[PDB]
Amino acid sequence: GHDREVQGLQVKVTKLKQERILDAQRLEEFFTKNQQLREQQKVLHETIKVLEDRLRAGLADRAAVTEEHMRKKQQEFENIRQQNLKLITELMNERNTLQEENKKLSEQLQQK
Amino acid sequence: HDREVQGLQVKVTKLKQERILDAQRLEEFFTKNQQLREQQKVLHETIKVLEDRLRAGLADRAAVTEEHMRKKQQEFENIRQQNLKLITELMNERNTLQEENKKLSEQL
């Protein structure tokens, strides 16, 4: 009757009011979880910047630092080569002046 | 009970409308939540792709320079031992000429 129908309606109003308390707080949780993901993406973007800065820095630095050593290694070799070339020329000149004198004495003994 | 039962059924339908609207806002927050989830996976995939380019770039520059240090020192040692061989050949020839000259000078 009138009492039962009013009782049934007041129950529906109470149950809906409790669900609205839960729904409003579920929205607040979704908002905080989304803002947490945004601040987490800020950190990941900073990490991407450091990696892209080290891709250009590591490529352009090692390309010039390794050339510094390839250059200085040949300079070491060229100094040794220059010392060896001076030895080769002095010995070749000393040998030629000696070998000419050997044929002069060898033909002198045969003619006599 | 006529103006009261009607007065409650309106409040029920108003509350149901507020829960339907909140259910739509929960769908909006949920879809925006999964979008940021997929964006983080992209950032994680991007970070891993860049970290792999580091390992590939370093192992390449470390192996290319090792090929240069190997072939350069192979050249310098082939040249140096070529000069050592030549210098010793000239020295032995100089010595054997001085011996023969001193022998021939005494023969006369």
End-to-end alpha-carbon separation of chain A, Å?
A: 163
In the numeric block, which tokens belong to residue A24?
Answer: 């409003």
CA angle A24, A27, A30 (to 5 degrees): 155
Judge contact between B13 and A17, C-beta under 8 A: no
In chain A, residues 51-110 whose CB comes closer than 8 Å to chain B = 51-52, 54-55, 58-59, 62-63, 66, 70, 73-74, 77, 80-81, 84-85, 87-88, 91-92, 94-95, 98-99, 101-102, 105-106, 108-109
Q: Minimal Cα–Cα distance from A103 to chain B, Å?
A: 9
How far apart CA B89 and CA B85 sit, in angstroms, is 6
How far apart CA A16 and CA A18 sit, in angstroms, is 5
How far apart CA B15 and CA A108 sit, in angstroms, is 136
How far apart CA B39 and CA A38 sit, in angstroms, is 10
Residue partners of B79: CB distance under 8 A and separation at least 6 = A77, A81
Residue partners of A98: CB distance under 8 A and separation at least 6 = B94, B97, B98, B101
